[PDB]
DNA sequence: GCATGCATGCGCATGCATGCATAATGCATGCATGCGCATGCATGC
DNA sequence: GCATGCATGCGCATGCATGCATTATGCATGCATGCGCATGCATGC
């Protein structure tokens, strides 16, 4: 064991030392600038990398890994001691909490002489005056672990995990230190909290009440108290790491002030945390002794082009898929044996926000939302808000699910009115559907693609060659960039000029006239014109042009013609 | 407590006896290599055969079975001594090691229904199924605290179940110094061990008909935490003890009995190389021929079943795409063509085999379900038949009686091999990679020859495309074929097991020739033994072949030839449509044949065999 | 997390306390002298010198206090028990003020005994009756017996049998008064079994002790009435008052008239006529 | 009790200081020959000059005079260490060795009349005459028992004045087995140590004329049993401690003070 | 040497601080299961 | 495809074994010392 004073001094010198890294290509005092910002209310939390510390001392890193909480507290105290040195000016604008801190420090200077004896209980709690939080970043050398294998050997260690989010709690304030005022004195009493539950005090420990033996009684205050942001997270294993025949395991995470509001249900996250237990008191058990429940305390959470190049053919369908991803509802009907499911899988993997449903497995409560112990939790349609949703084997779905899907496509909101639930849910998502061989699809959807397997010898032979190549060389014959391109594209919004309207109008009229000439035609309406306008706007957005052009309209017309034929 | 013991004849003698038991110097014992293996694998417990101990020292075995705790303590002390002797450095890591038990306990082999107070404080063996499991929880053993006021650290030791009875003086968590200075707990320096509780029920197959079941409660310590799961058939060997109730004045006199586990069991080269290298094609030839002597003929179905046993190759790519590697078969035939016998044989031979008939299991019991746990309010997943049979076999008898929705549910398993589950509050993707056997009767009771197979089968094209192979079996009443069948059946009927007296009531690579089971003519050939067959099947399943450039163009050209012959086949009808899945089926069967003969690459002969199978199955007269 | 317990903290505040402040100001302000030659700080310098030399005691004259403020002097004549504590605390605070730069290591600030002295004419010991209980009296006499110096505890600490928890810094009362140990262990223990009844033991090595003496005083032969047996009294001496008087000396003593307090014990002996009589002393 | 201590700066540093104090390699010290003489004479305690310690290390002397018990424990531990170092074989005979004190204590040189509560828990020196003595009595330290029914022998350890406060769980004499089989005490295998009590009075030549005398009570341990007799003028150096009264509910608050001798000298 | 004085000496009473002996009953909490309700799935015609 | 049946499913009440919380007073014993007695030693005259 080593004395904490020496390591505290080492921490202080490490914070004062580093000059190395700068983004603009120079040598910049990073931690000094961070501390100067911390001096005032220009930064309310600080993150420390354990890769930068590894340059000078690895034993510090190991001791931090095995005894993380103590080192977190030591770091907090060291930074708090360093703060007065770097301070250069008073606060330009301050809020209520700063007003208490300043007033308390001012009267502490007013009253306390340097020589008088002060009881250990007479000091201010450290965390009450402090207003900055310290968190750690996991070592790059350290390998992320699996939820299944963290056990009693890992209690108290520093770990890094990767998982899928399933449950998130709404933000609520959590008590840190409670403040009490006596009934017959001007003194203030502070009660730190480090337990799930606590018992409020009654009598006043202040010196004046003790000397007079007045028996004054304490009262809580909320303004003087310190509160923090608190969230609760549920994570599960990836399907890849589950052993044979088992079921994914779950873990619970707790989230602090600035880390709050980072993750959403359904996201894949990487969490740097400390593995700590909770002493459990409750119903009696078989085995005597001290049992506990484990949980994780987080300190950092981190979340034309070729589309599905493995699948041969369907180039126009791929262009339509690109347009749907870029944005301004697509349905595919095909014979069995044509890979429609794999296109939907690729779409789900590519999209940032996406969901993929297979049929009756996610039917009913899997869609819409339900009430659970009370909080309302949404289904796939709710999760895919402002994303893209994918549905396979559409015709096999129950009628209620199809009605809900139609409502989402047309109205873009869901309405639920049943015993215990009365809500309207926002679902601004575009739908891609797959099915096997109706007027509803033609009337409601925007674009339908019919894939018929005509046994042409040349096409079949080329498909066979491509499949053999894929199976043998495990790569197509000769996503991050695509995601970045789509993100940059969606930033702009082109506009339709006044003149082109006439041209568009003419086209529409002529199209309808042809549809009226061909009595075998089925649907033309203003919805088709709206779809054409949306496709042209999407193409103009792809060109990053401010004004809609002729080529976009021609390509949209050609795509609609190809789909209809 | 300052009380100490100076002499104890029984304990010292028992320790000496175990020391002599585990020496293995002047004997053919193996425990030395077992200890070396434990040191190599960083594990900290040993399993010792009870029958071996009884053979070497019967008195010690009798005492251990009759009295458990003290003898087990002596065992653990002897293990500590010998681990220190062989390598004292490794013994520093762990406090104390543990002993497992194994062998035929005899009279103490006891069912959960027959556990009684007569077996208390002894070591018992029990066979059952697991019904309830609990979350893993840590328990404190050694606690460490630090005092910022005085810069002093202290440590407290805990021992609760080490001693039979505990007192309020122990199990007290320290929080304050001698001068009331606060202490700060330091979780890194403390010591914890895992703890779990499970429940075991007598298997419904063994329980008397019409009677309610009986169950036992088991505690799993730090090592055996993850060794059990609900819905599992296990055998547990351990002590049977009473549970001390907490302090009180008046007691009713009824204790709680809990079984403390010590062993948990999941009940279940030159020859191979020479045989494979010498035989090559004859490997699969004999394996197909010697699949099941009890079944007469049907070489194609035997070949297909062997292809299921060997299987294809699972492949993955950069984009996360998944390509199926399993095979699926559907048999349709007239009654009494021994389809169910084939299914039962595949159940017996395959490692992970589950039978699920048509209406025996519904769509929920096939894949999985979600249930709300009343104890906590959370959502939990319960696995179905197909999820349990990961990388295994599911047999479906009377496949035609299955409802449409169940088949739509099975689509997800048959296409991609995964199951997607979702209900508000939880959603998951479970792995269900599996292979399916199915047997379905014709719609008209007996297969009509004149009508095309589409009318007789009565199944949609999508479901047919889901299956890799379709086979049709008929009972042709040829007098010579009937004579052969009668000969075979009566030869099997007249046979009696060797070593059993007549009239009573009730490993070589190649099986020994039998006068009746094989016949005089078959002396020129032999059949492969079942055990070697299983070993070879496992080895072949391990092997990973690769496709060659010679056969890819050949297979592609033949696929194009079939899709063009679609117009040429005018004299006969087609059983199944030809889609993109047919090419994958060709490659899969080629790889299965390449697995049959141990090699490194897929050759042309495997492609030819696959194509022969496809041509036979896909068209009928 | 349910393991730690950080405790309780408080901050300094933003009529007895005012009385202590008044006494402290009197000690720091009092001076004697002339307008021509200035004034000298009597009690400040006296306390400084006594603390520096190592004599933890000072003597205060009531006339000086009455000159400074009559209210406190009048208060001390009626409730000596509380105002003596307040004046001792004020003296300790003043001594801390004057002698802050002490040699290193000896940071502990020790208590200070305050003695009283006055020029009031004495009164006969025979005048002691029920009306003078708990007041301040002045009496002459002759000492005839003095017991040995013994030890009496002022701060005690006790330990629990089972969980070994401790209660520390319990203040004892001055005079001939006892203390009753508690019977219940005040620890929150849920899931744990609980401590038995009467689990506390006195720890002797962790207590603060002071000197103790008892004296026997007899009426002066100069004032004993003719033909009457002399009367006697028992005196209590604490800390620095011990060994200041030898038997045979003629002494004048200022003190508080009190009774012993050792619980409501039953009367003993074969004589039980007296009811509700507590032995008295000074 | 499973509670143990891992670190303690003060105790470890004090033990190191005494280790350096009793080395006598680079110095003209004599304590090495003193230890060799003790080994030769089979005695098991040492006398060390206080003035010598103050000259070599003034802080340790100040702490030892102001605080006795812990520093004496450190002394005894250091003696055990060095006796083991010089000759580990001889250290096997005795459990723990003891330390005597000698030299001019100065202010702590105190008459029986001037002993006060100010010197409690410190080491004091007193000069007086002996008036009362008591018979030598043995005291049990380690007990050994045998069970004829089961042919097993057990041993119990006792520690009463080693710890400041004792509890009813300890100091219990075993008489029955776990199955109520009688146990037979075997006095040969047990361990006993002698005990005596004496009283010291201030010499009449020193007491003020015409005043009654004052006295102190002393406890003599196993080694110093026969070193005193009544009517003798002696000087005693030792600790001055309070005496723990037996269990009760109501306490008057008056302890008994007893001097525990460490050195007794015939002047 | 005999007559007298007398400092020493011994046994049983009371007074007073410490110390010793005693010793079941009533109220609260979690596990098991009935009873009313709405959703939803499956099965006919 | 629409009308009906219905095995599954959920939330709040009571009943019953274990478990939890409470809690000073009166009587006995050994140390100190007075009071009556007989022996015995020492000191005069
Ligand atoms: N154009 C294509 N290119 C490559 N592979 C294809 C193509 N069409 C079909 N496949 C293969 O055929 C299989 C089709 O199965 P699936 O997509 O599940 O059919 P469906 O989606 O109609 O149920 C896929 O595994 C895929 O590998
Ligand atoms: N090829 C065969 N070889 C041997 N026995 C056969 C054969 N075909 C039929 N059998 C006999 O006929 C019976 C058929 O029963 P089963 O397998 O239930 O027929 P299915 O499954 O067609 O209803 C079996 O008991 C089997 O002994
Ligand atoms: Mg599909
Ligand atoms: Mg059958
Ligand atoms: Zn107050
Ligand atoms: Zn306690």
Closest by CA to A171, choosing from A45, A260, A301, is: A260
| CA-based nearest residue to B318, from A479, A435, A73 | A479
B216 phi and psi angles, rounded to 5 deg: -130, 150
* Distinct helix (H) and strand (E) counts, chain B: 19, 26
Decide: A224 and A179 in contact? Cβ < 8 Å.
Answer: yes
CA B599 – CA B605 distance, rounded (Å): 13
**Rounded distance in angstroms from the CA atom of residue D205 to the C1' atom of nucleotide F43:** 32
| Tokens read off for B336 | 């009494």
Residue A564 annotated as binding?
Answer: no
Please give the Cα distance from A427 to A355 (Å, whole number): 13
- The whole-angstrom distance between residue A63's C-alpha and the CA centroid of its chain comes to 31
Neighbours of A384 (CB within 10 A): 26
Short-list B416, D170, C255, B231, CA closest to A341: B416
Of the candidates B437, B345, B422, which has an alpha carbon nearest to the alpha carbon of residue B386? B437
**A430 labelled binding-site residue:** no
Q: Which residues 250-279 on chain C approach chain A with CB closer than 8 angstroms?
A: none
> Looking up tokens 């359904």, which residue turns up?
A266
Largest pairwise CA distance in chain D: 70
Name the residue with tokens 């490659």: B587
Distance D203 CA to E14 C1' (A): 35
The answer to whether A122 and C11 are in contact (CB under 8 A) is: yes
| Three-class HEC string of B159-218 | CCCCCCCCCCCCCCCCCECCCCCECEECCCCCEEEEEEEEEEECCCCCCCCCCCCCEEEE
Residues 198-217 of C with CB under 7 A from strand E: 198
D236, D224 contact by CB (below 8 A): no
Q: Helix B530-542 and helix B270-279: axis angle, to 10°?
A: 80
Q: What are phi and psi of B472, to 5 degrees?
A: -120, 130
- Beta bridge pairs of residue B275: none
Q: Which spans in A414-549 are helix H?
A: 439-444, 457-473, 480-489, 498-517, 526-543
Q: Are D65 and D53 in contact (CB under 8 A)?
A: no
How far apart are the C-alpha atoms of A447 and A436, rounded to whole Å? 16
Collapsed DSSP state (helix, strand, coil) of residue B394: strand
Q: Which residues of C187-225 are buried (b: 16+ CB within 10 A; e: fewer)?
A: eeeebbbebeeebbbbbbebbbbbbbbbbbbbbeeeeee
Rounded Cα gap, residues B461 and D151, in angstroms: 87
Residue A384, Ramachandran bin (φ over 0: left; ψ between -120 and 50: alpha; else beta): alpha
Tell whether C1 is within 8 A of chain A (Cβ): yes
The strand pairing partners of A254, in sequence order, are: A232, A297
Pick the residue of C146, C202, C249 with the most D CBs within 10 A to test the interface with D by mutation: C202
Would the CA dihedral through A26, A29, A34, A38 be positive or negative? negative
User: How many angstroms does the Cα of residue B155 sit away from the middle of ligand 6?
Assistant: 20
Nearest to C203 among D117, D164, D168 (CB): D164
How far is it, in rounded angstroms, from Cα A326 to Cα A494? 13
Strand E contacted by A247 CB (< 7 A):
no
Task: Collect all residues with Cβ–Cβ distance below 8 Å to B330 and sequence separation of at least 6.
Answer: B399, B438, B439, B440, B467, B469, B470, B471
Among B575, B299, B592, smallest CA distance to B435 is for B592
Structure tokens, B180: 């009331």
Three-class secondary structure of residue B158 per DSSP: coil
Residue nearest to nucleotide F19 (CA to C1'): B248
Residues bordering ligand 5, an ion, CB closer than 5 Å: A 182, 185, 204, 206, 209, 216
Q: Please state, in angstroms and rounded to a whole number, the distance separating the CA atoms of residues B608 and B602.
A: 11
Map residue B130 onto helix, strand or coil.
strand
Residue C198's nearest nucleotide, by CA–C1', is: F23
3-state SS class at A407: helix
Sequence-distant (6+) residues with CB within 8 A of A32 are: A16, A86
Q: Is A340 annotated as a binding residue?
A: yes
Listed residue (C188, C185, C212) closest to C201, CA to CA: C185
Collect all residues from B whose CB is shorter than 8 A from any CB in D.
2-9, 144, 151-159, 170, 174
Residue A279: Cβ-neighbour burial (10 angstroms; 0-12, 13-18, 19+):
middle
Q: Return all residues near B149 (Cβ < 8 A) that are at least 6 apart.
A: A120, B177, B181, B182
Tell me: is residue A180 an annotated ligand-binding position: no
Tokens of C101: 């730069």
Instruction: Assign a CATH topology to domain A304-560.
Output: Rossmann fold (3.40.50)
Q: How close B134 comes to chain C (CA, Å)? A: 20
The CA distances from residue A165 to A371, B426, D249, in Å, are 18, 10, 62
Residue B512 DSSP class:
P
- DSSP helix/strand/coil, A278: strand
CB proximity list for B133: less than 8 A, separation 6 or greater: B196, B197, B198, B199, B228, B229, B230
Question: Does C180 sit within 8 Å of D255, measured CB to CB?
Answer: no
Query: SS3 of C124, please?
Result: coil
Q: Yes or no: say if D131 and D119 are a contact pair by the CB < 8 Å rule.
A: no
Distance CA B32, CA B34 (A): 5
Q: Which tokens belong to A217?
A: 């009684």
Where helices occur in D67-129 by DSSP H, the ranges are: 69-86
Strand, coil or helix: A416: strand
Q: Token pair for residue B3?
A: 């009380």
B5 CB neighbours in chain D (<8 A) are: 152-155
How far is the C-alpha of A51 from the C-alpha of A115, rounded, in Å? 44
Give helix A68-86 / helix A58-66 axis angle, nearest 10°. Answer: 120
Tell me how crowded residue A254 is: count the other CB atoms within 10 A of its CB: 18
Q: How far is CA B396 from the centre of its chain?
A: 19
The number of C-alpha atoms within 13 Å of D61 and in the hemisphere containing its C-beta is 19
Token pair recorded at residue A170: 């709404």
User: After which residues does chain C have a break in its backbone, defined as C to next N over 2.5 Å?
Assistant: 14
**One-character DSSP codes across C167-183:** EEEEEPPSSSB-EE---
Contact A201 C1 (CB under 8 A): no
Q: How far apart are CA A162 and CA A143, in angstroms?
A: 11
Token pair, residue A313, equals 């053919």
Spell out a b/e string for B126-146, using b for 16 or more CB atoms within 10 Å of the CB, else e: bbbbbeebeebbbbbbbbbbb
User: Dihedrals φ, ψ of A418, to 5°?
Assistant: -135, 175
| Residue A462, C-beta contacts closer than 8 angstroms, at least 6 positions apart | A312
Burial readout B457-483 (b: 16 or more C-beta within 10 A, e: otherwise) = bebeebbbbbbbbbbbbeeeeeeeeee
Resolution (A): 3.1
d(CA B157, CA B170): 9
Nearby residues of A94 by Cβ (< 8 Å), 6 or more positions away? A41, A102
Token pair belonging to B364: 């929920």
Under DSSP, is residue C51 helix (H, G, I), strand (E, B) or coil?
helix
Q: Which of B249, A564, A554, C160 is nearest to D247 (CA)?
A: C160
Task: Give the helix/strand (H/E) hosting B411.
Answer: helix B404-415
CB-based burial of residue B9 (10 Å sphere; 0-12 exposed, 13-18 middle, 19+ buried)? exposed
Greatest CA separation found in chain A? 105
Full DSSP string of A113-128: -SSS---GGGSPPHHH
List b or e across B593-616, with b for residues whose CB sees 16 or more CB atoms inside 10 angstroms: bbbbbbbeebbeebbebbbebbee
- Report the b/e string of B379-409 with b at 16+ CB within 10 A: bebebbbbbbbbbbbbbbbbbbebeeebbbb
- Distance separating alpha carbons of residues B391 and B385, to the nearest angstrom: 12
Strand partners, A401: none
Residue C146 Rama label (left phi>0; alpha psi -120 to 50; beta) = beta
Which residues neighbour strand F (beta carbon < 7 Å)?
Answer: A 284; B 245-249, 252, 254, 371-372, 374; C 183-184, 190-191, 194, 197-198, 266; D 249-250
DSSP state of A244: T
Kindly state the tokens that stand for B17: 């006896």
| Residues B399, B439 contacting (CB under 8 angstroms) | yes
β-strand pairing of B215-220 with B256-266? parallel
Count of residues in chain B: 621
């Amino acid at each position: 064991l080593k004395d904490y004073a020496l390591e505290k001094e080492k921490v202080k010198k490490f914070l004062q030392e580093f000059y190395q890294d700068d983004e603009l290509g120079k040598k910049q005092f990073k931690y000094g600038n961070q501390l100067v910002r911390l001096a005032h209310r220009e930064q309310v939390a600080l993150y420390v990398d354990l890769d930068d510390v590894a340059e000078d001392d690895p034993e510090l890193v190991d001791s931090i890994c095995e005894n993380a909480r103590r080192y977190a507290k030591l770091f907090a105290d060291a930074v708090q001691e360093l703060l007065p040195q770097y301070k250069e000016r008073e606060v330009v604008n301050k809020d209520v909490l700063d007003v208490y801190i300043e007033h308390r420090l001012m009267m502490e200077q007013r009253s306390r002489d340097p020589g008088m004896v002060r009881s250990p209980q007479n000091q201010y709690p450290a965390e009450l005056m402090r207003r900055f939080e310290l968190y750690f970043q996991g070592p790059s050398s350290n390998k992320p672990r699996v939820i299944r294998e963290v056990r009693a050997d890992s209690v108290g260690k520093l770990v890094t995990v990767r998982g899928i989010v399933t449950r998130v709690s709404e933000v609520k304030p959590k008590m840190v230190v409670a403040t009490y005022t006596c009934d017959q004195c001007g003194a203030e009493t502070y009660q730190p909290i480090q337990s799930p539950t606590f018992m409020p005090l009654i009598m006043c420990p202040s010196q004046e009440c003790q000397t007079n033996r007045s028996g004054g009684r304490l009262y809580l205050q909320t303004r003087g108290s310190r509160f923090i942001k608190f969230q609760e997270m549920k994570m599960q294993e990836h399907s890849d790491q589950v052993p044979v025949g088992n079921i994914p395991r779950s873990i619970t995470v707790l989230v602090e002030g600035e880390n709050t509001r980072i993750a959403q249900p359904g996201d894949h996250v990487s969490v740097t945390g400390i593995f700590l237990p909770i002493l459990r008191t409750g119903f009696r058990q078989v085995v005597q002794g001290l049992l506990s429940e484990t949980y994780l305390e987080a300190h950092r959470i981190v979340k034309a082009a070729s589309i599905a190049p493995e699948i041969y053919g369907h180039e126009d369908v791929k262009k339509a898929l690109l347009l749907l991803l870029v944005g301004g509802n697509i349905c595919l009907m095909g014979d069995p044996g044509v890979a429609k499911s794999q296109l939907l899988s690729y779409i789900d993997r590519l999209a940032p926000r996406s969901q993929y449903t297979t049929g009756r497995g996610s039917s009913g409560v899997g869609l819409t939302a339900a009430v659970l112990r009370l909080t309302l939790e949404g289904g796939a349609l709710v999760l895919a808000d402002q994303g893209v949703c994918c549905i396979d084997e559409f015709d096999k779905m129950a009628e209620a699910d199809r009605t809900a899907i139609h409502e989402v496509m047309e109205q873009q909101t869901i309405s639920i009115a049943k015993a215990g639930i009365l809500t309207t849910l926002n679902a601004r998502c575009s739908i891609l559907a797959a099915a096997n061989p109706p007027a509803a699809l033609l009337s409601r959807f925007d674009l339908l693609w019919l894939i018929q397997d005509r046994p042409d010898r040349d096409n079949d032979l080329r498909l066979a060659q491509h499949i053999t190549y894929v199976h043998q060389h495990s790569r197509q014959p000769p996503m991050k960039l695509m995601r970045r391109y789509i993100a940059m594209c969606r930033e702009k919004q082109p506009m339709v000029p006044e003149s082109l309207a006439d041209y568009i109008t003419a086209a529409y009229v002529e199209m309808r006239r042809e549809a009226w000439a061909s009595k075998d035609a089925t649907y033309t309406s203003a919805r088709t014109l709206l779809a054409i306008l949306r496709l042209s706007t999407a193409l103009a957005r792809l060109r990053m042009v401010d004004v809609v052009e002729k080529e976009d309209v021609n390509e949209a017309i050609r795509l609609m013609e190809m789909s209809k034929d | 407590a300052g009380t100490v013991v100076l002499d104890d004849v029984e304990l010292r003698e028992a320790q000496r006896d175990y020391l002599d038991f585990l020496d293995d110097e002047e004997d053919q014992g193996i425990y030395q290599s077992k200890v070396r293996e434990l040191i190599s694998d960083n594990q900290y417990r040993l399993i010792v055969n009870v029958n071996d101990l009884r053979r070497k020292n019967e008195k010690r075995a009798n005492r251990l079975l009759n009295n458990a705790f003290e003898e087990l303590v002596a065992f653990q002390r002897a293990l500590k001594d010998f681990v220190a002797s062989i390598d004292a450095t490794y013994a520093k890591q762990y406090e104390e090691f543990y002993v497992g038990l194994e062998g035929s306990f005899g009279s103490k082999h006891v069912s959960p229904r027959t556990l009684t107070s007569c077996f208390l404080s002894c070591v018992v063996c029990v066979e059952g199924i697991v019904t309830k499991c609990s979350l893993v929880r840590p328990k404190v053993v050694r606690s460490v605290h630090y005092c910022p006021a005085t810069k002093k650290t202290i440590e407290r030791r805990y021992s609760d179940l080490t001693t039979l009875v505990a007192f309020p003086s122990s199990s007290v968590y320290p929080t304050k110094d001698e001068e009331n200075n606060p202490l700060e707990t330091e979780y890194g320096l403390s010591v914890y061990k895992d703890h779990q509780t499970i429940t075991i029920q007598e298997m419904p197959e063994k329980a008397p008909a019409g009677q309610l079941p009986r169950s036992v409660d088991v505690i799993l310590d730090d090592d055996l935490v993850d060794k059990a799961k609900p819905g599992d058939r296990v055998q547990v060997v351990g002590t049977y003890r009473c549970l001390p109730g907490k302090k009180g004045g008046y007691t009713s006199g009824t204790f709680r009995t809990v079984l403390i586990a010590c062993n948990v069991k999941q009940m279940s080269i030159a020859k191979i190389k020479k045989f494979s290298k010498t035989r090559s094609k004859d490997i699969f030839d004999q394996l197909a021929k010697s699949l099941a002597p009890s079944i007469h003929g049907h070489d194609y179905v035997k070949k297909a079943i062997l292809c299921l046993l060997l299987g294809g190759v699972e492949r993955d790519l950069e984009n996360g795409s998944h390509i199926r590697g399993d095979i699926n078969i559907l048999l349709i035939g007239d009654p009494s063509v021994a389809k169910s016998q084939l299914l039962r044989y595949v159940l017996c031979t395959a490692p992970r085999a589950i039978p699920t008939t048509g209406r025996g299991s519904s769509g929920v019991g096939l894949t999985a379900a979600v249930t709300t746990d009343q104890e906590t309010g959370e959502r939990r997943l319960e696995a179905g038949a197909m999820v349990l049979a990961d990388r295994g076999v599911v047999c479906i008898d009377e496949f035609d009686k299955m409802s449409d929705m169940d088949r739509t549910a099975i689509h997800e398993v048959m296409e991609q091999g995964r199951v997607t589950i979702a209900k508000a509050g939880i959603h998951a993707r479970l792995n269900a990679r599996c292979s399916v056997l199915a047997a379905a009767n014709p719609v008209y009771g007996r297969y009509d020859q004149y009508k095309t197979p589409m009318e007789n089968i009565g199944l949609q094209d999508s479901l047919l495309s889901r299956f890799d192979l379709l086979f049709i079996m008929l009972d042709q009443m040829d007098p010579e074929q009937d004579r052969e069948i009668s000969d075979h059946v009566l030869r099997m009927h007249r046979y009696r097991a060797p070593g059993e007296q007549d009239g009573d009531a009730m490993t070589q690579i190649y099986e020994k020739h039998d006068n009746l089971l094989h016949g005089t003519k078959k002396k020129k050939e032999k059949m492969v033994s079942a055990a070697f067959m299983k070993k070879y099947i496992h080895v072949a399943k391990i092997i990973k072949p690769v496709l060659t450039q010679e056969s890819a163009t050949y297979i592609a050209e033949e696929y194009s030839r079939l899709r063009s012959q679609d117009s040429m086949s005018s004299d006969t009808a087609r059983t199944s449509p030809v889609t993109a899945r047919t090419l994958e089926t060709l490659i899969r069967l080629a790889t299965a044949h390449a697995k049959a003969r141990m090699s490194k690459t897929v050759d042309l002969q495997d492609a030819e065999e696959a194509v022969e199978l496809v041509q036979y199955a896909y068209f009928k007269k | 997390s349910g393991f730690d317990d950080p405790g309780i903290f408080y901050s300094d505040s933003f009529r007895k306390s005012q009385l202590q402040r008044r006494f402290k100001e009197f000690l720091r302000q009092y001076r004697v002298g002339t307008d021509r030659t200035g004034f000298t700080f009597k009690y400040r310098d006296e306390l400084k010198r006594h603390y520096n030399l190592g004599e933890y005691w000072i003597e205060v004259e009531m006339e000086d206090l009455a000159s400074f403020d009559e209210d406190l002097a009048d208060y001390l004549y009626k409730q000596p028990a509380e105002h003596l504590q307040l004046l001792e605390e004020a003296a300790k605070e003043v001594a801390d003020e004057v002698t802050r730069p002490r040699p290193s290591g000896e940071e502990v600030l020790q208590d200070i005994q305050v003695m009283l002295k006055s020029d009031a004419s004495p009164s006969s010991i025979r005048s002691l009756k029920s009306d003078m209980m708990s007041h301040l009296v002045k009496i002459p006499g002759i000492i005839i017996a003095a017991s040995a110096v013994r030890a009496k505890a002022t701060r005690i600490s006790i330990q629990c049998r089972s969980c070994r928890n401790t209660l520390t810094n319990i203040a004892m009362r001055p005079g001939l008064e006892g203390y009753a140990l508690p019977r219940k262990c005040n620890t929150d223990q849920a899931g744990r079994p609980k401590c038995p009844l009467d689990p506390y033991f006195i720890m002797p090595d962790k207590c603060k002790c002071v000197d103790f003496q008892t004296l026997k005083l007899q009426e002066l032969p100069d004032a004993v009435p003719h033909g009457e047996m002399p009367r006697h009294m028992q005196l209590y001496c604490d800390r620095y008052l011990c060994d200041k008087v030898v038997p045979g000396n003629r002494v004048t003593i200022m003190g508080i008239y009190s009774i012993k307090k050792f619980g409501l014990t039953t009367s003993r002996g074969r004589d039980r006529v007296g009811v509700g009589i507590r032995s008295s002393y000074i």
